[PDB]
């Protein structure tokens, strides 16, 4: 198991549990502002997107 | 006629290959410039 | 049929009259068309839904109460095509003008009355300025009549009872089709007689004949895109191509 | 309604951008979406809710080219780093469509199959007939003229090579290989006895090690 | 809504939307401009028209729309129809179809400091002169020129938008939401603000904001469907040198039928090449070369 | 997407309150095409008119009575000024009042139907007759001697002409996939016929040019094709 953060942007922190060995933080800017997506796994990000994949509990934030 | 054919085969094959290679390499080397504006060193992308 | 036509409408409005001596001898006034009553003449013959004139210009009013209005318009109307003698065909198109807002009881349509040497005559034709007119690239104009038609079949309270129709009888100039399609087609088709002179040992007869057939098929491919697929008649070039392919 | 309830059901023609995958065309499957949201209102002043999880398909006219396998509508909340209190809402309705391939099967694949079958038949034509390359080059001509039909019929996209494009290129390469090998066969057939001496390896391979049907006379 | 309606009524008292906001004389209304491209719809080469879907972000400030939130129950934002406020009449100057203006006139967002935010979407068909020399392996430099239709540089100062400390000198593209065009890839996307120093200051359209799109064509369709089949069919003609030079060898049949196939290919490409005349396209040059080679083979 | 009438005109209002409005309209309406028998097909096209907003409890629809009256159920066509479409003949033109199903807890409409038959002369001249001629030529390749050396040319150029006619037809046929038009079935049948003519011509040319010193005769071939079958085939 692995305990990973999953909240959006600067929301109150919330947490989930999954089976993958890595948590991911995904940052990208849209026309309104900056979006941060947190979860588990290491997704294949399209270019122009910052990705932080880390392999320790509660490492997204 | 046979020896004339053998000479002109090589001649025409050389012509065909040379023209094909010239056209294809002019296609291959037509790339977008590395910078949007010539003479300007900036790249005009959002820094990260 | 697509036309650029300036429609001239004249009518007396007894409310829009004045004596020129009480207004500084003013003898003409230009007003927006949205300020006055209009008969609302439209092209009933349109096939694209554009009933109305294009540019709603000013009306000219005069002390007598007469109202003159010359709106220009671009009109797309339905002209049925007779393909029987193509490309040596002539077509009969019409522009049918009437009011869908008013009936024969409300307005009465008539042709313009012009004057020569103090004698009046109805203008029974489409006006074309001879100096400024540029002929169409493929269509020559042969007749330009104009009529007022009142049919008794429809009821009297129908706005379609009265109309003014301007007709264009136009002949195609066949030069493009003669040069580019017809002459090559005929000359290739008449080469089918040459296989009778070809010997049977060195002259490949069937290859030549089937190649003439192939060229005829290519000419059918060319023709098929340029005419409607109607069933009133077979085109004349189509008749020749079918005859040549059978031969 | 007298309670202030408003129902408003306007129509629209929606022209929506959708990523089209042409890889498996004409057996391709598309997933195309419609993202709808309040343009100038965020989620704190206007809340949009889906009426149901599914788009309403009760009045859907059946299509002659596409079958909708599944459809759904998802509401999305978007929060930004600068403003942690104001959400931005949208509802995305998506439809998964499958192309009906009969038109392209009949009008493209079948003539390509017919031209492909006639490609190898030049190898049953004897060389003494003098009609081998007539057959081969004229099949090539038929393929080249049918290229016009295919280009007129298929969409012209450069995102990926479709299956029809791959089959067309395979058929063309098949014909060209048949032409090359037929030229080799015709050259072998017309080899003069005097100018071209027979190699021993050729005689060994093609005349001596021939355990194939003996209907032939070595 | 009572506070919102109160604020709107107090704000719209004596407000003329057709008069430029200036509190003192010789004031220049600063207008910041940003362009987001959501999808490159197409580039029609025969009309030389780039069709694009854009969202234009315009920010200016109007002293007449100022208010204090504490006087209106803490109201900190107001959505107003864009027709009721004064607008900088920003238009795409280089349009090819006659559409100068935005597609939808949405609401503006007025803030208590009087600063107005407007994000209208637009469909734009802009003029792109196509350089045809290397077609279909070409790249194009399309332009989107935005300027005020009516106001001059002494009236509005049209500049590029500033985010936190950095000027946005590029077309903005959403990394997540962008679907790439099926025939064009965007390599560079800069933005510039041009003001000719010797231009008349009283004339309207001299300060321009120009967004450039340098786009490379993906030539895979032409490679698959035109170029490679033509290369193969032309290379068939080289094989006639191995056929015998007698009756039944069929040299002339093969060569001339290859030429017939090349003429069919001329018809195929005739419906796809641009019709300008500064340069001969690369594909046209190659097809002419292949034709001439087949002619020489027949000779 | 166009719902409205073409032109804004007057409404005739009688003193008793009767309201007569006869607007013009140009309407592009959805017609699901049955492609199976194209271009010898007939189509059942439909025009559904209804109140967009008001329901049956507010606006009740009925079929428009003509000047004939007598509870008409027909589209009216004035026979003098109506020029028939050159491609289509109107067989039936009825009108009906469709009522919706009963709600346990669609709106009422007036529907005008046009059953129209295509007039196929163009396709008979341009597609069918050349196909018949090409098939007739494909028959006669078997009467060509093998020694003339012109079988492959004739057969494949017939196939090439068929491909040209496929190019001709590609611009005209419907693009749906619920069925195959009968004209496309005929075209593919003719293409398969010409392909089989090519195949059998290749077999005949193979038999004619079999090397005598290499290929020996199976005795069953000699029994059938030299002794038995010739007196059945009149050779
Ligand atoms: C326009 C140009 C048309 C050009 C046509 C020429 C076609 C090529 C062949 C020319 C040579 C023919 C020849 O030598 O035949 C004979 C000569 O007699 C003739 O020439 C026959 C009559 C020819 C009439 C030509 C015009 C009408 C046919 C037009 C048909 C094609 C139409 C094409 C339209 C595009 C040879 O035989 P002989 O020497 O007579 O000896 C035998 C005598 N005996 C039979 C009595 C025993
Ligand atoms: C595609 C075209 C056919 C492909 C297969 C033909 C096979 C072949 O070589 O011809 C056969 C013809 O055997 C005969 O004796 C003649 C048979 C044909 C005439 C009678 C039946 C057909 C016509 C009905 C009216 C066998 O001949 P072969 O000399 O045994 O060929 C050996 C070739 N191998 C070693 C590669 C197997
Ligand atoms: C005979 C009919 C008319 C001929 C003379 C026309 C008059 C004329 O202006 O000549 C023009 C004929 O342009 C050429 O240069 C020739 C055509 C282009 C070269 C072939 C293209 C593909 C070559 C692949 C094998 C010369 O005008 P120009 O503008 O100097 O030519 C364009 C320059 N360019 C050819 C470098 C692009
Ligand atoms: C796929 C289905 C094929 C349908 C073809 C078919 O029914 O046969 C066709 C013949 O065959 C022809 O193609 C007729 C020859 C060409 C038409 C020229 C004469 C015009 C006929 C008329 C002058 C049927 O054509 P038909 O026998 O003329 O009958 C059609 C009815 N008609 C008289 C209204 C035209
Ligand atoms: C003699 C040869 C030439 C004459 C006929 C020409 C062929 C075209 C034709 O009539 O289609 C035939 C075969 O078409 C198919 O290819 C079968 C349909 C299945 C396609 C692939 C299945 C996997 C029949 O069409 P169909 O495809 O069987 O369509 C009927 C099924 N449907 C109406 C429910 C869709
Ligand atoms: C309007 O825009 C101009 C720039 O185009 C601003 O000018 C500069 O602003 C910086 C930062 O405030 C100052 O340090 C410079 O001194 C300014 N230069 C000039 C030309 O004065 C200007 O401040 C903007 N005006 C408003 C009201 O925001
Ligand atoms: C107009 O012209 C007439 C000519 O007789 C003249 O008497 C009159 O004074 C002029 N002015 C006005 C205002 O009528």
UniProtKB/Swiss-Prot annotation, chain B:
TM ranges: 7-27
Subcellular location: Postsynaptic cell membrane; Cell membrane
Quaternary structure and interacting proteins, as annotated: Pentamer of two alpha chains, and one each of the beta, delta, and gamma (in immature muscle) or epsilon (in mature muscle) chains.
Family, per entry: Belongs to the ligand-gated ion channel (TC 1.A.9) family. Acetylcholine receptor (TC 1.A.9.1) subfamily. Gamma/CHRNG sub-subfamily.
Protein function: After binding acetylcholine, the AChR responds by an extensive change in conformation that affects all subunits and leads to opening of an ion-conducting channel across the plasma membrane.
Name of this protein: Acetylcholine receptor subunit gamma
Species the sequence originates in: Bos taurus (Bovine)
Range of the intact protein held here: 471 to 518 of 519
UniProtKB/Swiss-Prot annotation, chain C:
Domain of life: Eukaryota
Segments in the Extracellular topological domain: 1-173
Subcellular location: Postsynaptic cell membrane; Cell membrane
Transmembrane segment boundaries: 174-198, 208-225
Role played: After binding acetylcholine, the AChR responds by an extensive change in conformation that affects all subunits and leads to opening of an ion-conducting channel across the plasma membrane.
The family this protein is said to belong to: Belongs to the ligand-gated ion channel (TC 1.A.9) family. Acetylcholine receptor (TC 1.A.9.1) subfamily. Delta/CHRND sub-subfamily.
Quaternary structure and partners: Pentamer of two alpha chains, and one each of the beta, delta, and gamma (in immature muscle) or epsilon (in mature muscle) chains. The muscle heteropentamer composed of alpha-1, beta-1, delta, epsilon subunits interacts with the alpha-conotoxin ImII.
Protein name stated in the entry: Acetylcholine receptor subunit delta
Section covered of the full-length record: 72 to 318 of 516
Curated annotation (Swiss-Prot), chain D:
Membrane spanning stretches: 101-125, 133-151, 167-186
Annotated localization: Postsynaptic cell membrane; Cell membrane
Residue positions the entry lists as glycosylated: 31
Disulfide-linked positions: 18-32, 82-83
Similarity section: Belongs to the ligand-gated ion channel (TC 1.A.9) family. Acetylcholine receptor (TC 1.A.9.1) subfamily. Alpha-1/CHRNA1 sub-subfamily.
Subunit structure and binding partners: One of the alpha chains that assemble within the acetylcholine receptor, a pentamer of two alpha chains, a beta, a delta, and a gamma (in immature muscle) or epsilon (in mature muscle) chains. The muscle heteropentamer composed of alpha-1, beta-1, delta, epsilon subunits interacts with the alpha-conotoxin ImII.
Function, in words: Upon acetylcholine binding, the AChR responds by an extensive change in conformation that affects all subunits and leads to opening of an ion-conducting channel across the plasma membrane.
Protein name as it appears in the record: Acetylcholine receptor subunit alpha
Lineage per the UniProt record: Eukaryota, Metazoa, Chordata, Craniata, Vertebrata
Whole sequence portion shown: 131 to 348 of 457
UniProtKB/Swiss-Prot annotation, chain F:
GO molecular function: acetylcholine receptor activity; acetylcholine-gated monoatomic cation-selective channel activity; channel activity; excitatory extracellular ligand-gated monoatomic ion channel activity; transmitter-gated monoatomic ion channel activity involved in regulation of postsynaptic membrane potential
Any Gene Ontology CC annotation: plasma membrane
Glycosylated sites: 44
Keywords: Cell membrane, Disulfide bond, Glycoprotein, Ion channel, Ion transport, Ligand-gated ion channel, Membrane, Phosphoprotein, Postsynaptic cell membrane, Receptor, Signal, Synapse, Transmembrane, Transmembrane helix, Transport
Location in the cell: Postsynaptic cell membrane; Cell membrane
Keyword Cell membrane: yes
Disulfide bonds: 31-45
Source taxon at top rank: Eukaryota
Transmembrane stretches, start-end: 120-144, 152-169, 186-207
Biological processes per GO annotation: acetylcholine receptor signaling pathway; behavioral response to nicotine; chemical synaptic transmission; membrane depolarization; monoatomic cation transport; monoatomic ion transmembrane transport; muscle cell development; muscle contraction
Quaternary assembly: Pentamer of two alpha chains, and one each of the beta, delta, and gamma (in immature muscle) or epsilon (in mature muscle) chains. The muscle heteropentamer composed of alpha-1, beta-1, delta, epsilon subunits interacts with the alpha-conotoxin ImII.
Family, as annotated: Belongs to the ligand-gated ion channel (TC 1.A.9) family. Acetylcholine receptor (TC 1.A.9.1) subfamily. Beta-1/CHRNB1 sub-subfamily.
């Amino acid at each position: 198991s692995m305990i990973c953060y999953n909240q959006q942007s600067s929301q109150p922190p919330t947490t989930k549990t999954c089976s993958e060995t890595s948590c991911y933080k995904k940052t990208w800017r849209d026309h309104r502002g900056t979006i941060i997506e947190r979860g588990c796994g290491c997704p294949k990000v399209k270019p122009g997107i910052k990705l932080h994949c880390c392999r320790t509990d509660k490492c997204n934030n | 006629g046979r020896v004339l054919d053998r000479v002109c085969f090589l001649a025409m094959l050389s012509l065909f290959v040379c023209g094909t290679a010239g056209i294809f390499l002019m296609a291959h080397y037509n790339r977008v410039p590395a910078l949007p504006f010539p003479g300007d060193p900036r790249s005009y992308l959002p820094s990260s | 049929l697509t036309t650029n036509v300036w429609i001239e409408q004249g009518w007396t409005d007894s409310r829009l009259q004045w004596d020129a001596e009480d207004f500084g001898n003013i003898s003409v006034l230009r007003l927006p068309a949205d300020m006055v009553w209009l008969p609302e003449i439209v092209l009933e013959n349109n096939n694209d839904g554009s009933f109305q004139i294009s540019y709603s210009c000013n009306v000219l009013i005069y002390p007598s109460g007469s109202v003159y209005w010359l709106p220009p318009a671009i009109f797309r109307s339905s002209c049925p095509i007779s393909v029987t003698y193509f490309p040596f065909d002539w077509q009969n198109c019409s522009l049918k003008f009437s009011s869908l807002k008013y009936t024969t009881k409300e307005i009465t349509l008539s042709l313009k009355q012009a004057e020569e040497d103090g004698r009046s005559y109805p203008v029974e034709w489409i006006i074309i300025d001879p100096e400024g007119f540029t002929e169409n690239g493929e269509w020559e104009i042969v007749h330009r009549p104009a009529r007022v038609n009142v049919d008794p079949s429809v009821p009297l309270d129908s706005p379609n009872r009265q109309d003014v129709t301007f007709y264009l009888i136009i002949r195609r100039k066949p030069l493009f089709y003669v040069i580019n399609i017809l002459v090559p087609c005929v000359l290739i088709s008449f080469m089918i007689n040459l296989v009778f002179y070809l010997p049977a040992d060195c002259g490949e007869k069937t290859s030549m004949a089937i190649s003439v057939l192939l060229a005829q098929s290519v000419f059918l491919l060319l023709i098929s895109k340029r005419l409607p697929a109607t069933s009133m008649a077979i085109p004349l070039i189509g008749k020749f191509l079918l005859f040549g392919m059978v031969l | 309604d007298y309670t202030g309830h408003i129902t408003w059901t306007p129509p629209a023609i929606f022209k929506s951008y959708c990523e089209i995958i042409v890889t498996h065309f004409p057996f391709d499957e598309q997933n195309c979406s419609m993202k709808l949201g309040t343009w100038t209102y965020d989620g704190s002043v206007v809340v949009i809710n889906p009426e149901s999880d599914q788009p309403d398909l009760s009045n859907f006219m059946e299509s002659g080219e596409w079958v909708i396998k599944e459809s759904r509508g998802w509401k999305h909340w978007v929060f930004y780093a600068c403003c942690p209190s104001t959400p931005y809402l949208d509802i995305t309705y998506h439809f998964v469509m499958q192309r009906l391939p009969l038109y392209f099967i009949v009008n493209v694949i079948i003539p390509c199959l017919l031209f492909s079958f006639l490609t190898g038949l030049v190898f049953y034509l004897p060389t003494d007939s003098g009609e081998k390359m007539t057959l081969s080059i004229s099949v090539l001509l038929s393929l080249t003229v049918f290229l016009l039909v295919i280009v007129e019929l298929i969409p012209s996209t450069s995102s990926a090579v479709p299956l029809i494009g791959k089959y067309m290129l395979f058929t063309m390469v098949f014909v060209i290989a048949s032409i090359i090998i037929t030229v080799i066969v015709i050259n072998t057939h017309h080899r003069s006895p005097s100018t071209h001496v027979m190699p021993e390896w050729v005689r060994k391979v093609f005349i001596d090690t021939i355990p194939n049907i003996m209907f032939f006379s070595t | 809504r009572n506070q919102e309606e109160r604020l709107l009524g107090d704000l719209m008292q004596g407000y003329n939307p057709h008069l430029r906001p200036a509190e003192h004389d010789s004031d220049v209304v600063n207008v910041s401009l940003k362009l987001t491209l959501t999808n490159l719809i197409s580039l029609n080469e025969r009309e030389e028209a780039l069709t694009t879907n854009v969202w234009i972000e315009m920010q200016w400030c109007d002293y007449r729309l100022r208010w204090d939130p504490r006087d209106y129950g803490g109201l900190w934002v107001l959505r107003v129809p864009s027709t009721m406020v004064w607008r900088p009449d920003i238009v795409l100057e280089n349009n090819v179809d006659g559409v100068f203006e935005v597609a939808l006139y949405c609401n503006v967002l007025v803030s208590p400091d009087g600063c107005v935010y407007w994000l209208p979407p637009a469909i734009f068909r802009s003029s792109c002169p196509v350089s045809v020399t290397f077609f279909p392996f070409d790249w194009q430099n399309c332009s989107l020129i935005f300027q005020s239709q009516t106001y001059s540089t002494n009236e509005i100062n049209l500049q590029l938008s500033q985010e936190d400390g950095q000027t946005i000198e590029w077309i903005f593209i959403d990394p997540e939401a962008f679907t790439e065009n099926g025939e064009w890839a965007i390599r560079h996307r800069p933005a510039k603000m041009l003001l000719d120093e010797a231009a008349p200051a009283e004339e309207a359209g001299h300060q321009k904001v120009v967004f450039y799109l340098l786009i490379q064509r993906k030539p895979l369709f032409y490679v698959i469907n035109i170029i490679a089949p033509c290369v193969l069919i032309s290379s068939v003609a080289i094989l006639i040198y191995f056929l015998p030079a007698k009756a039944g060898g069929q040299k002339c049949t093969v060569a001339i039928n290859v030429l017939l196939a090349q003429t069919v290919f001329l018809f195929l490409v005739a419906k796809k090449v641009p019709e300008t005349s500064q340069a001969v396209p690369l594909i046209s040059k190659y097809l002419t070369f292949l034709l001439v080679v087949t002619i020489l083979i027949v000779v | 997407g166009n719902f409205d009438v073409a032109l804004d005109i007057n409404v005739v209002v009688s003193s008793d309150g009767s309201m007569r409005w006869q607007p013009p309209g140009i309407y592009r309406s959805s017609c699901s095409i049955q492609v199976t028998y194209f271009p010898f097909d007939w189509q059942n096209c439909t025009m559904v008119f209804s109140s967009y907003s008001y329901d049956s409890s507010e606006v009740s629809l009925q079929t428009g009575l003509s000047p004939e009256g007598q509870e008409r159920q027909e589209v009216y066509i004035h026979e003098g000024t109506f020029i028939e479409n050159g491609q289509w003949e109107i067989i039936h033109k009825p009108s009906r009042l469709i009522q919706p199903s009963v709600d346990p807890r669609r709106r009422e409409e007036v529907t005008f139907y046009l059953i129209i038959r295509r007039k196929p002369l163009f396709y008979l001249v341009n597609v069918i007759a050349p196909c018949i001629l090409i098939t007739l030529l494909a028959i006669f390749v078997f009467y060509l001697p093998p020694d003339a050396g012109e079988k492959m040319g004739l057969s494949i150029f017939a196939l090439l002409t068929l491909t040209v006619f496929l190019l001709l037809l590609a611009d005209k046929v419907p693009e749906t996939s619920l069925s195959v038009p009968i004209i496309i079935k005929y075209l593919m049948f003719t293409m398969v016929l010409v392909t089989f003519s090519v195949i059998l011509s290749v077999v005949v040319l193979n038999l004619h040019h079999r090397s005598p010193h290499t290929h020996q005769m199976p005795l069953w071939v000699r029994q059938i094709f030299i002794h038995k079958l010739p007196l059945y085939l009149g050779l």
